């Protein structure tokens, strides 16, 4: 599955076997970046992204891979952070235009569909290249409940109970299979999300990482918020103790 | 709209599209013009007309204004565009400035027109050189020449086209105060220069004269052969 | 074949680097900044004695207080000088004052990397300007000299040489120039170095000299007053 | 101008006069006001005469483009929506008062389109200058589910009422009967008005007019 | 020559020496990249759609993963191929269906909806700027004058009416299965058309699948509204098959 | 976001042939056979409507398409490209009727359709059509028949054949076609020319035929095709 | 985008345009077309390439196009690109008639189209028109005229010229027989048949294979007519008997 | 080999070479050091000269009263982004009257630089910037690359031989927070000195300092204004 001369240069060009390699190489860009997880619970969604520390000089909180699309919508990104921020701005504007026209908070199933259409629009032309990043969306409300969606460089959106994207997406998904996220409360999920990243993290290939987590459920009244210093370190303590 | 870069720089530091346009002007017919005391005269060589063609349409000498005329070399399709664009500018100058257009101003416009086409997207360079001839309001004779790149220079005597180097070296040895003494001797200097490259001239030569008060005068083959008979008469006397 | 805005593995644009190579084929120009003025010297380089030497102008005035010397492709330079002349008059119309030498140079430096194929106007630039410029003038800060190249990197210079023999002339300027020299010495030194780098011998109808001083406006040296400093060979 | 339409048991009968006036002077004595839209839908016209013709012909052109792509008979609602949206965009500057009537797969449908872009679906509608005189006949004699000949008599009396009582209307009565299988385009249904023939002719004698210059040009 | 190439006939949508469009031919192979098969069968009373519903892991939300789409209340379709391109063609189909009812008054027929999508996909075939969509749409719905209608559009731009159709990897094998059923005279009722559709996907692929492994959508004369059967009704048809 | 190519894809070869047009003419040659015959009393157009699967609905999509009340079209080659040419021919016919209030002449419509086909051989970023068209019509009490190819050229024919084995069709046509044939006789000789290159029995669904006369252009119903097909009349 | 670009408006190392010269090769394959000037009139003569048994023949001409009341042209090259150029020539002629209220001079109409053809060769990135055009007409300034057009936008006023297949051999044959300022329309038609018969692939010459149109000023009005087959048959037979009279 | 011509073309490894080549432009320009404390943010930059007769290049540019930058790479691309940063700061003062926060402005650069990296025929901005700013949250040091990705850092140095400066800042990173204004700058020059070889040290002509914070607005020190900072230097550690 490798073509050298032609077929893989333009996003508007099909290969002899019927594949678009320019999208596939953008999917290889997200494979080289660190793992980003997100598990849907009974009363919300919990995100967890490992941030590889390139230099010790950078401030804690820099290169954030957790974004606020809407006041109720969260965004966990993986891949090239340059394209991740641009898709965040488009997602923010899509949520802004919905409230301006109809007057209520945008449903996640509609928001994930509208952004994925914008992602897809960059995979058919030679003038533009596909986004080299994959991202996740999560929200909680009274009527819709807990919802989680994932969108890849191609422009495909699906619902998830627990998804992972990055370096070891296969190794992370095997850890979520053991969990009972259908019955578990999101307070217990933060405790379990933290320990998966520590197991997945390759500390002999990579140096050191910084843990980043996010709330979005009934605990935070529907609003997507960042995990407080008290709860994050309490889940981080369990992550190190369960490793032994 | 077509926005591809046509003229681009090269590893050595040359603009090939400009250089190839300079190869197109060399392949064209020869054109020589000299500056005299009272009259400025330009002439074209290698007409190579099949004699079965009307020689009124293929005239390379074109008057831009009442006091400005030009002769070209190379791609005749490209020059016809430039001539017409320059002819509009002569009238456009009059609408903004009530004074008639000078030789130096019209040459600067043609050069800048050629320069913009060597830098704009989708456009190719003009493959022509123009010999701009005329008189100023003071009455001082002028001779200018342009090139595909867009550079203009004033000359006393210059040639462009095929065998341009051969006529230039001839003019470097011939152009003196005695050569441009009278009005007839200025015209005789052109024909003597034309016969150096052209294969047995007489009918293959077309030249126009203009005075500092009188309009452009296109001389007929009956008048040219009068000088041809005179030049060869003095050429016979030496041997 | 590649695009015009393509980066090299080295870390620079191709079209810009080739435009620097285009200057090395052009004629040489020497500019010296003095405490009592700025002088500009350039060779005309006459190909044939039939061509008029007065027609070849490589030093032109932008304003009454700023002169400019050009090297490389003359055709492309006249577009930059014309744009610089408008900018000085646009500033005069709006602010009722003459621009500083640094500001005029900065205005031309803005048209450096404004070339491209896509996402551009129908009549936009496709290639960089292969011209090296020497902006010499006097403002409220005093006599100043600036150097500009196709990349758009402009800097103040005490003595700068640009053209064919740029390396040979610059080394000669390094051993002669000092801070407290006179304008007459600046014109003298520039001419001795100019004849060393030339292929054809120095003559009155072969060179261009222009001086901008705090006393008077932009001055172009005529054939008569040129021979006054040529007699001191 | 007096135009009217009716809906009976089988189809639709459309009525129109033939008087066209320039100000207060009759320009045309015999003018067609029932216009072709499709082989099943016809439309009466009122208001600005130049606007009536070009608005009709454009929709008739678009529906022929529409019917050939679909491969089936065009609907009356399609003709209505095309006239409604196009007249609304011009904010009533195109003075076109229309009575749309045609037989569809669904059945008979009658519409009245105003120049501003408002449509009304009714069993009977009247438009034009003599619309008030024509409606008075309908509001007195109309009954649901009529026979073809009974419906033809009602519209003809309605148009005639606008002919004699209104100065803007006159001359012949035109009727267009459209059903599920039959289409009757009776151009001169009734001619109530007749010119009193010239009993005393004033024919000019040959050579009574003075001529100054004469030129004759032969033809092939 | 039979298989000759000259210039860029395999990179952009231009003619080959024989007169074949390679980029268009590669788009049909992009349909088979999904690894799914769709079967459509038309009866005298109903139009039936049946497609594989592959759920590789428990992490995915099963309800979100669907190839059945609703365009109008009376018109539905199924998508086969690239899911990113599939959703883009559905959103366009929903636009053309709504625009028809606004401009022309009456509801769009299935015949005209498929023709419109085929004309849009033709632009991709003639223009070199963009690649054709690597997806296939099979539309179902009842025309209020003619009856049940089944239509299918190609990435090439070919559209046609059908008595029975198939799309995907097992397309050419399943089309042969429908031919044997059509040749023999059958009384095509609601239960007859559904069971023929399910057995076709069950004999070619050889699985004998569960109710959660397939998705069925029908449009009947009494109920012209597009309806998805779901796991509750699909299982009822499956247990009735293992009888004769 | 998209832009669009401005350069032509169809260009001249060193030999002097347009490469993309000749390949488009190769595309039409590998299509279903289509015949058209003028009879001085009417026009007849017949094409191969092979479905080769049975599963397809034969009455759904038509190859013979009407443009107006008196003009129709029959093609060979690619289906999708033909459909766009139909809509364009239908729109150009209506644009003439809105201006001149007269049914468009057949000779005039072909000129307008071929002009569109000429564009796609010269316009930016587009390939030519892989379709050759047979246009029929009736105006001024005279029947008409034309042929328009990918290049944009149009020819007037009495009787011609397209698709696969067009060389065998025309040679059979010049052997059978005669001037002053009746409309009913024209259909018989048109349905026989299609049998020359067919194979696998003719049924009312296997071919499609349309007629044009003083009454206007209309497609013949499968019931009418059935009678003209059962060996005898 | 630049990878798929053919680059049509670009100079070559030798200082020539490739796409124009390749379009010149396209015209050399087309039918033989010649036009010659006479004292009392002017005519065009073209080789009809559309020759088949089942061709309908509806139009007045195949390659001869009427542009103005006093002007007509002929075509050599691609027929499709010619239909666009001839239509443009009809528009320019009418724009001049609307503006000045007098017929457009012959030289002005030729230069107008050649400006458009020059534009395609300089900017746009599109293929040039592979059509050579021969114009015949009359104006009140110079009289009867003949012009030749090139894909590059190059024009020339001729007295006797040929373009198309065997153009180089035909122009030398026209150089042999033509007499300057003495040729009448009667002797011109005999000369045109003489050249067409010799410089042709299929000789013998028939009426269907050739097309001749004449332009003559009569009674203060320009008359443009295409000669019918019976009129052409007589001109061929007059040269055919000259072939038999040569052997004596 | 063939994927290194356009930004739109992806590498089989999952990379864009044209962005990577644009990053090489930053490494070729001279090094500059940017560090912050609790009240101040200082930019120390090294100047280059093509010849000894020519003056030294400008390295620190004005943006606003509270925001300043130090560039590394292409000069024309530096001024083009600087004009954008100046315009966005002017728009905020025109509309909201309040000075635009540093975190907002850096996000605007990450939005503008992302556009050309995705379109055909467009190039990334070949210049790296170190942004010093002070708002109602404290001092800020921001790093921007040719790629739209930006960094919020405590101390950073980018340019030629800037790795030696990067090692010094990492060992003294905990010291910066409680540093005096005079001491904070001295840490900046000592980092900039590590980039240069043991043959030469810092002088008044090639050192530029830009200081912004609570005490004063953004000010650039050049020749005679830089000498109070240079005096009292710790001797060269080879």
UniProtKB/Swiss-Prot annotation, chain B:
Subunit-structure text: The 26S proteasome consists of a 20S proteasome core and two 19S regulatory subunits. The 20S proteasome core is a barrel-shaped complex made of 28 subunits that are arranged in four stacked rings. The two outer rings are each formed by seven alpha subunits, and the two inner rings are formed by seven beta subunits. The proteolytic activity is exerted by three beta-subunits PSMB5, PSMB6 and PSMB7. PSMA7 interacts directly with the PSMG1-PSMG2 heterodimer which promotes 20S proteasome assembly. Interacts with HIF1A. Interacts with RAB7A. Interacts with PRKN. Interacts with ABL1 and ABL2.
Protein name listed in UniProt: Proteasome subunit alpha type-7
GO cellular component: cytosol; nucleoplasm; proteasome core complex; proteasome core complex, alpha-subunit complex
Keywords carried by this UniProt record: Acetylation, Cytoplasm, Glycoprotein, Nucleus, Phosphoprotein, Proteasome
Keyword GTP-binding: no
Tissue-wise expression: Detected in liver (at protein level).
Residues glycosylated per entry: 129
GO biological process: ubiquitin-dependent protein catabolic process
NCBIfam families, per database record: PRK03996.1
Modified residues (Phosphotyrosine): 152
Family according to the record: Belongs to the peptidase T1A family.
Modified residues (N6-acetyllysine): 226
Annotated InterPro entries: Ntn_hydrolases_N (IPR029055), Proteasome_alpha (IPR050115), Proteasome_alpha-type (IPR023332), Proteasome_asu_N (IPR000426), Proteasome_sua/b (IPR001353)
Localisation per UniProt entry: Cytoplasm; Nucleus
Primary residence: cytoplasm
UniProt-listed Pfam families: Proteasome (PF00227), Proteasome_A_N (PF10584)
Induction annotation: Up-regulated in liver tumor tissues.
Gene Ontology terms for molecular function: identical protein binding
Curated annotation (Swiss-Prot), chain C:
Main location: cytoplasm
SMART domains (UniProt xref): Proteasome_A_N
Protein family according to the UniProt entry: Belongs to the peptidase T1A family.
Residues recorded with modification Phosphothreonine: 47
Key word Glycoprotein present: yes
Organism: Mus musculus
UniProt protein name: Proteasome subunit alpha type-5
Compartments, record wording: Cytoplasm; Nucleus
UniProtKB/Swiss-Prot annotation, chain D:
Function description: Component of the 20S core proteasome complex involved in the proteolytic degradation of most intracellular proteins. This complex plays numerous essential roles within the cell by associating with different regulatory particles. Associated with two 19S regulatory particles, forms the 26S proteasome and thus participates in the ATP-dependent degradation of ubiquitinated proteins.
Protein name: Proteasome subunit beta type-7
EC number: 3.4.25.1
Biological-process GO terms, alphabetical: proteolysis involved in protein catabolic process
Keywords (A to Z) from UniProt: Cytoplasm, Hydrolase, Nucleus, Protease, Proteasome, Threonine protease, Zymogen
Subcellular location(s) of the protein: Cytoplasm; Nucleus
Chain ranges passing through the membrane: none
Gene encoding the protein: Psmb7
Record's keyword annotation contains Cytoplasm: yes
Induction: Up-regulated by the antioxidant dithiolethione (D3T) in colon (at protein level).
Taxonomic superkingdom: Eukaryota
Keyword Hydrolase carried by entry: yes
A single GO molecular function term of this UniProt record: threonine-type endopeptidase activity
Residues annotated as catalytic: 1 (nucleophile)
GO CC, one annotated term: nuclear body
Subunit structure: The 26S proteasome consists of a 20S proteasome core and two 19S regulatory subunits. The 20S proteasome core is a barrel-shaped complex made of 28 subunits that are arranged in four stacked rings. The two outer rings are each formed by seven alpha subunits, and the two inner rings are formed by seven beta subunits. The proteolytic activity is exerted by three beta-subunits PSMB5, PSMB6 and PSMB7.
Family: Belongs to the peptidase T1B family.
Reaction(s) catalysed (UniProt annotation): Cleavage of peptide bonds with very broad specificity
UniProtKB/Swiss-Prot annotation, chain H:
Superkingdom per UniProt: Eukaryota
InterPro entries found in the cross-reference section: Ntn_hydrolases_N, Proteasome_alpha, Proteasome_alpha-type, Proteasome_alpha1, Proteasome_asu_N, Proteasome_sua/b
Glycosylation sites: 107
SUPFAM superfamilies according to UniProt: N-terminal nucleophile aminohydrolases (Ntn hydrolases) (SSF56235)
Modified residues (Phosphoserine): 107, 174
Gene Ontology MF terms in the entry: lipopolysaccharide binding
Cell compartments where the protein resides: Cytoplasm; Nucleus
Gene3D superfamilies: Glutamine Phosphoribosylpyrophosphate, subunit 1, domain 1 (3.60.20.10)
Pfam families documented for this protein: Proteasome (PF00227), Proteasome_A_N (PF10584)
Tissue: Detected in liver (at protein level).
Residue ranges the record marks as coiled coil: none
Record key words, sorted: Acetylation, Cytoplasm, Glycoprotein, Immunity, Isopeptide bond, Nucleus, Phosphoprotein, Proteasome, Ubl conjugation
Post-translational note: C-terminal extension is partially cleaved off by limited proteolysis leading to a conversion of the proteasome from its latent into its active form.
Quaternary structure annotation from Swiss-Prot or TrEMBL: The 26S proteasome consists of a 20S proteasome core and two 19S regulatory subunits. The 20S proteasome core is a barrel-shaped complex made of 28 subunits that are arranged in four stacked rings. The two outer rings are each formed by seven alpha subunits, and the two inner rings are formed by seven beta subunits. The proteolytic activity is exerted by three beta-subunits PSMB5, PSMB6 and PSMB7. Interacts with NOTCH3. Interacts with ZFAND1.
Family under the similarity heading: Belongs to the peptidase T1A family.
Descriptive protein name: Proteasome subunit alpha type-1
Gene: Psma1
């Amino acid at each position: 599955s490798s073509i050298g001369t032609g077929y893989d240069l333009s996003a508007s060009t099909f290969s002899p076997d019927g594949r678009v390699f320019q999208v596939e190489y953008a999917m290889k860009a997200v494979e080289n970046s660190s793992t980003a997880i997100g598990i849907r619970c009974k009363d919300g969604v919990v995100f967890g992204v490992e941030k590889l520390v390139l230099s010790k000089l950078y401030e804690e909180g820099s290169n954030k891979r957790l974004f606020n699309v809407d006041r109720h919508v969260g965004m966990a990104v993986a891949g090239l952070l340059a394209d991740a921020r641009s898709l965040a701005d488009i997602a923010r504007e899509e949520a802004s235009n919905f409230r301006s026209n109809f007057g209520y908070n945008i449903p996640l199933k509609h928001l994930a569909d509208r952004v994925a259409m914008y992602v897809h629009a960059y995979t058919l032309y030679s003038a533009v290249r596909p986004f080299g990043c994959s991202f996740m969306l999560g929200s909680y409300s009274a009527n819709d409940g807990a919802q989680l969606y994932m969108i890849d460089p191609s422009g495909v959106s699906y619902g998830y109970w627990g998804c992972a994207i990055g370096k070891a997406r296969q190794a992370a998904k095997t850890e979520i299979e053991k969990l009972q996220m259908k019955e578990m409360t999101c307070r217990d999920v933060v405790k379990e999300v933290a320990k998966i990243i520590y197991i997945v993290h390759d500390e002999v290939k990579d140096k050191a990482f910084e843990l980043e987590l996010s709330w979005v459920g009934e605990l935070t009244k529907g609003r997507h918020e960042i995990v407080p210093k008290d709860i994050r370190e309490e889940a981080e303590k369990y992550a190190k103790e369960s490793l032994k | 709209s077509y926005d591809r870069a046509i003229t681009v720089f090269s590893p050595d530091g040359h603009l090939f599209q400009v250089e190839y346009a300079q190869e197109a002007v060399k392949k064209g017919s020869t054109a020589v013009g000299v500056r005299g005391k009272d009259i400025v005269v330009l002439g074209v060589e290698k007409k190579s007309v099949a004699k079965l063609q009307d020689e009124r349409t293929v005239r390379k000498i074109c008057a831009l204004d009442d006091n400005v005329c030009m002769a070209f070399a190379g791609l005749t399709a490209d020059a016809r565009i430039v001539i017409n664009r320059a002819r509009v500018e002569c009238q456009s100058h009059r609408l903004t400035v009530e004074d008639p257009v000078t030789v130096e101003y019209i040459t600067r416009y043609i050069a800048s027109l050629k320069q913009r086409y060597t830098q704009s997207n989708g456009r190719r360079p003009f493959g022509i050189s123009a010999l701009i001839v005329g008189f100023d309001f003071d009455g001082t004779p002028r001779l200018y020449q342009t090139d595909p790149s867009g550079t203009y220079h004033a000359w006393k005597a210059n040639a462009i086209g095929r065998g341009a180097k051969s006529v230039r070296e001839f003019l470097e040895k011939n152009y003196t105060d005695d050569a441009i003494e009278t009005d007839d001797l200025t015209i005789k200097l052109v024909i003597k220069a034309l016969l150096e490259v052209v294969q047995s001239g007489g009918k293959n030569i077309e030249l126009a004269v203009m005075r500092r008060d009188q309009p452009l005068k296109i001389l007929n083959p009956e008048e040219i052969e009068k000088y041809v008979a005179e030049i060869e008469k003095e050429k016979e006397e030496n041997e | 074949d590649r695009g015009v805005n393509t980066f090299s593995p080295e870390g620079r644009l191709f079209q810009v680097e080739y435009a620097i190579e285009a200057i090395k084929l052009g004629s040489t120009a020497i500019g010296i900044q003095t405490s009592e003025g700025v002088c500009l010297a350039v060779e005309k380089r006459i190909t044939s004695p039939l061509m008029e030497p007065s027609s070849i102008e490589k030093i032109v005035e932008i304003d009454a207080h700023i002169g400019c010397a050009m090297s490389g492709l003359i055709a492309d330079a006249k577009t930059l000088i014309d744009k610089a002349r408008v900018e000085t008059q646009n500033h005069w119309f709006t602010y009722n004052e003459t621009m500083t030498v640094e500001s005029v140079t900065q205005a031309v430096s803005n048209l450096a990397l404004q070339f491209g194929e896509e996402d551009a106007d129908p009549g936009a630039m496709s290639r960089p300007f292969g011209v090296a410029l020497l902006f010499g003038g006097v403002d409220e800060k005093g006599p100043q000299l600036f150097h500009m190249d196709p990349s758009g990197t402009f800097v103040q210079c005490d003595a700068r040489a640009i053209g064919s023999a740029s390396e040979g002339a610059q080394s000669s300027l390094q051993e002669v120039y000092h801070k407290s020299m006179t304008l007459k010495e600046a014109i003298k030194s520039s001419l001795i170095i100019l004849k060393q780098v030339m292929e054809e011998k120095l003559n009155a109808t072969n060179i261009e000299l222009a001086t901008v001083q705090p006393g008077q406006n932009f001055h172009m040296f005529t054939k008569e007053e040129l021979e006054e400093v040529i007699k001191d060979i | 101008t007096t135009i009217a339409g009716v809906v009976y048991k089988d189809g639709i009968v459309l009525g129109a006069d033939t008087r066209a006036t320039e100000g207060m002077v009759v320009a045309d004595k015999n003018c067609s006001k029932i216009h072709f839209i499709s082989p099943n839908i016809y439309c009466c016209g009122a208001g600005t005469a130049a606007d009536t013709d070009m608005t009709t012909q454009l929709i008739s052109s678009n529906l022929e483009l529409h019917s050939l792509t679909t491969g089936r008979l065009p609907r009356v609602v399609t003709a209505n929506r095309m006239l409604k949206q196009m007249l609304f965009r011009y904010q009533g500057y195109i003075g076109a008062a229309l009575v749309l009537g045609g037989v569809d797969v669904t059945g008979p449908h009658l519409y009245s389109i105003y120049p501003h872009g408002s449509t009304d679906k009714l069993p009977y509608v009247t438009m034009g200058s003599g619309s008030l005189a024509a409606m008075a006949v309908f509001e007195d004699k109309f009954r649901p589910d009529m026979e073809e000949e009974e419906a033809k008599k009602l519209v003809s009396e309605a148009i005639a009422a606008g002919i004699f009582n209104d100065l803007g209307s006159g001359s012949n009565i035109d009727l267009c009967v459209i059903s599920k299988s039959k289409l009757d385009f009776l151009r001169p249904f009734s001619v109530p008005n007749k010119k009193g023939t010239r009993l005393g002719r004033y024919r000019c004698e040959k050579g009574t007019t003075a001529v100054l210059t004469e030129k004759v040009t032969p033809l092939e | 020559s039979r298989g000759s190439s000259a210039g860029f006939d395999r990179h952009i949508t231009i003619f080959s020496p024989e007169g074949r469009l390679y980029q268009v031919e590669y788009a049909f192979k992009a349909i088979n990249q999904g690894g799914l098969t769709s079967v459509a069968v038309r009866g005298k009373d109903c139009a039936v759609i049946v497609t594989q519903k592959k759920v590789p892991d428990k992490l995915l939300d099963s309800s979100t993963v669907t190839h059945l789409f609703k365009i109008t209340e009376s018109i539905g379709c199924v998508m086969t191929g690239m899911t990113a391109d599939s959703r883009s063609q559905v959103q366009r189909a929903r636009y053309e269906a709504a625009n028809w009812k606004y401009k022309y008054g009456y509801e769009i027929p299935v015949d005209m909806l498929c023709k419109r999508i085929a004309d849009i996909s033709q632009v991709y075939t003639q223009n070199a700027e963009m690649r054709p969509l690597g997806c296939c749409m099979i539309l179902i719905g009842i025309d209020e004058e003619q009856g049940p209608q089944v239509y299918k559009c190609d990435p090439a731009g070919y559209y046609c009416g059908f008595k029975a159709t198939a799309a995907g990897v097992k397309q050419t094998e399943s089309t042969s299965f429908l031919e044997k059923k059509v040749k023999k005279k059958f009384d095509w009722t609601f239960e007859q058309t559904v069971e023929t559709a399910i057995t076709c996907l069950s004999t070619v692929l050889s699985i004998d699948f569960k109710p959660s492994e397939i998705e069925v959508g029908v449009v009947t004369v009494e109920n012209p509204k597009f309806r998805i059967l779901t796991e509750a009704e699909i299982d009822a048809h499956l247990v009735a098959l293992a009888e004769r | 976001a998209k832009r669009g190519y401005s350069f032509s894809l169809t260009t001249f070869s060193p030999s002097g042939k347009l490469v993309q047009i000749e390949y488009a003419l190769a595309a039409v040659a590998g299509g279903a056979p289509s015949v058209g015959i003028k009879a001085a009393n009417g026009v007849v157009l017949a094409t191969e409507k092979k479905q080769k699967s049975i599963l397809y609905d034969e009455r759904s999509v038509h190859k013979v398409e009407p443009i107006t009340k008196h003009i129709g079209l029959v093609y060979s080659g690619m289906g999708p490209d033909y459909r766009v040419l139909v809509h364009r021919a239908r729109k150009l016919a209506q644009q003439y009727y809105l201006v001149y209030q007269e049914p468009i002449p057949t000779a005039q419509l072909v000129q307008r359709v071929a002009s569109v086909m000429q564009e796609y051989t010269q316009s930016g970023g587009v390939r030519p059509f892989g379709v050759s068209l047979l246009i029929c019509g009736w105006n001024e009490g005279r029947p008409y028949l034309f042929q328009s190819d990918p290049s944009g050229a149009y020819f007037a024919w009495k009787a011609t054949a397209m698709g696969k084995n067009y060389v065998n069709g025309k040679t059979f046509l010049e052997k059978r076609y005669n001037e002053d044939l009746e409309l009913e006789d024209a259909i018989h000789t048109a349905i026989l020319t299609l049998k020359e290159s067919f194979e696998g029995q003719m049924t009312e669904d296997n071919i499609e035929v349309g007629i044009c006369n003083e009454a206007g252009f209309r497609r013949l119903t499968p019931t009418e095709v059935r009678d003209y097909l059962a060996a005898i009349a | 985008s630049r990878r798929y670009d053919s680059r049509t408006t670009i100079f070559s190392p030798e200082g020539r345009l490739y796409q124009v010269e390749y379009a010149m090769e396209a015209i050399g394959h087309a039918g033989t077309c010649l036009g010659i000037l006479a004292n009392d009139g002017v005519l065009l003569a073209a080789e009809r390439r559309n020759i088949h048994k089942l061709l309908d023949e509806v139009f007045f001409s195949e390659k001869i196009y009427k542009l103005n009341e006093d002007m007509a042209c002929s075509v050599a090259g691609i027929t499709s690109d010619a239909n666009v150029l001839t239509n443009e020539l009809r528009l320019i002629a009418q724009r001049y008639l609307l503006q000045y209220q007098e017929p457009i001079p012959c030289e002005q109409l030729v230069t107008a189209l050649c400006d458009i053809k020059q534009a395609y060769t300089q900017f746009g990135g599109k293929r040039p028109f592979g059509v050579s055009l021969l114009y015949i007409g009359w104006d009140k300034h110079y009289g009867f005229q003949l012009y030749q057009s090139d894909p590059s936008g190059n024009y020339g006023g001729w007295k006797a010229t040929c373009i198309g297949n065997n153009s180089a051999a035909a122009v030398s044959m026209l150089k042999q027989d033509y007499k300057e300022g003495e040729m009448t329309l009667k002797s011109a038609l005999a000369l045109a048949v003489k050249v067409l018969n010799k410089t042709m692939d299929v000789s013998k010459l028939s009426a269907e294979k050739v097309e001749i149109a004449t332009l003559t000023r009569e009674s203060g009005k320009t008359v443009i007519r295409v000669l019918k087959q019976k009129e052409v048959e007589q001109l061929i037979k007059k040269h055919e008997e000259e072939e038999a009279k040569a052997e004596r | 080999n063939q994927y290194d011509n356009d930004v739109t073309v992806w590498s089989p490894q999952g990379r864009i070479h044209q962005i990577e080549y644009a990053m090489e432009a930053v490494k070729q320009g001279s090094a500059t050091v940017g560090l912050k404390s609790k009240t101040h943010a200082v930019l120390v930059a090294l100047k280059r000269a093509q010849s000894e007769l020519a003056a030294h290049q400008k390295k620190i540019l004005h943006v606003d009263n509270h925001i300043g930058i130090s560039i590394a790479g292409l000069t024309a691309d530096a001024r083009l982004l600087c004009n954008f940063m100046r315009q966005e700061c002017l728009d905020s003062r025109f509309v909201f009257d309040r000075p635009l926060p540093v975190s907002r402005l850096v996000s605007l650069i990450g939005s503008k630089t992302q556009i050309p990296t995705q379109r055909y025929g467009r190039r990334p901005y070949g210049v790296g910037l170190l942004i010093a700013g002070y708002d109602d949250m404290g001092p800020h040091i921001f790093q921007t690359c040719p790629s739209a990705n930006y960094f919020d850092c405590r101390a950073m140095s980018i340019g030629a031989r800037s790795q030696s400066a990067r090692t010094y800042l990492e060992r003294h990173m905990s010291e910066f927070m409680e540093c005096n204004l005079d001491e904070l700058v001295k840490h900046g020059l000592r980092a900039l000195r590590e980039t240069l070889p043991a043959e030469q040290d810092l002088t008044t002509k090639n050192v530029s300092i830009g200081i912004v914070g609570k005490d004063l607005e953004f000010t650039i020190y050049d020749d005679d204004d830089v000498s109070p900072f240079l005096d009292g230097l710790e001797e060269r550690p080879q």
